[PDB]
């Protein structure tokens, strides 16, 4: 039941989903081991995901959140980078999207800087890199990213450098102790609890 609808780069919608993307590019510890050497991206392509169910899915979770914190369901829109994203924008976020080794436990990933969930893309630590040339750095395989409406409601803070919440919480949120350039990454343990809004087909850019 899903539909993608093709922005155009006139819209406002777009380009306001491309200034997010851009603008939250860093730096990375590895330098660029990863997702590959870029400092912005060429975006090829933003759609929006149209799919009924999984969006009523989605508000109905996130009116039980809301009614579990003060009427508030602390949504946000985060990037998602996985080699699922298909499988995501057609059947949702489920327990297979979850990341059993990360530093949160086994829940969905969700990133503040687009250029942490590129890292993803092809994998954990960037896989093998694209399929084609096996490049985790290509500069010519097109790329995905999902930008998502994610409901975090009580989250947990987590300082540092499917499971469970913590009790009494609706979601993790790993702040950045070190790195102070990093952005905030999120971990929810509900698939229901994030709805993949806009998929973005992008290209890195070799740096000049
Ligand atoms: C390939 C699997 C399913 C194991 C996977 C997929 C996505 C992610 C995930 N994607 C993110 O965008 C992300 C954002 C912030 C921190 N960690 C992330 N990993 C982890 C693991
Ligand atoms: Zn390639």
Not at 31 to 39: D, M, S
Not at 127 to 156: A, E, M, N, W
Not at 171 to 177: E, F, K, Q, Y
Request: overall charge neutral; charged content about 20%.
């Amino acid at each position: 039941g899903t539909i993608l609808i093709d922005l155009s780069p006139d819209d406002k919608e777009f380009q306001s989903v491309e200034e997010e993307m851009q603008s939250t590019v860093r730096e990375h510890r590895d330098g660029g081991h990863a997702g590959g050497i870029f400092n912005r991206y060429n975006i090829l392509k933003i759609q929006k995901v149209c799919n009924k169910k999984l969006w009523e899915r989605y508000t109905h979770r996130r009116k039980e959140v809301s009614e579990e914190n003060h009427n508030h369901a602390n949504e946000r829109m985060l990037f998602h980078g996985s080699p699922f994203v298909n499988a995501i924008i057609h059947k949702g976020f489920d327990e297979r999207h979850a990341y059993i080794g990360g530093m949160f436990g086994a829940g969905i990933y969700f990133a503040e800087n687009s250029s942490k969930s590129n890292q993803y893309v092809y994998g954990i630590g960037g896989g093998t890199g694209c399929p084609v040339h096996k490049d985790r750095s290509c500069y010519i395989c097109h790329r995905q990213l999902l930008f998502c409406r994610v409901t975090l409601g009580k989250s947990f803070l987590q300082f540092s450098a499917m499971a469970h919440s913590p009790p009494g919480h609706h979601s993790v949120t790993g702040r950045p102790s070190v790195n102070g350039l990093a952005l905030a990454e999120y971990v929810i343990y509900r698939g229901e609890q994030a709805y993949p809004e806009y998929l973005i087909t992008y290209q890195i850019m070799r740096p000049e």
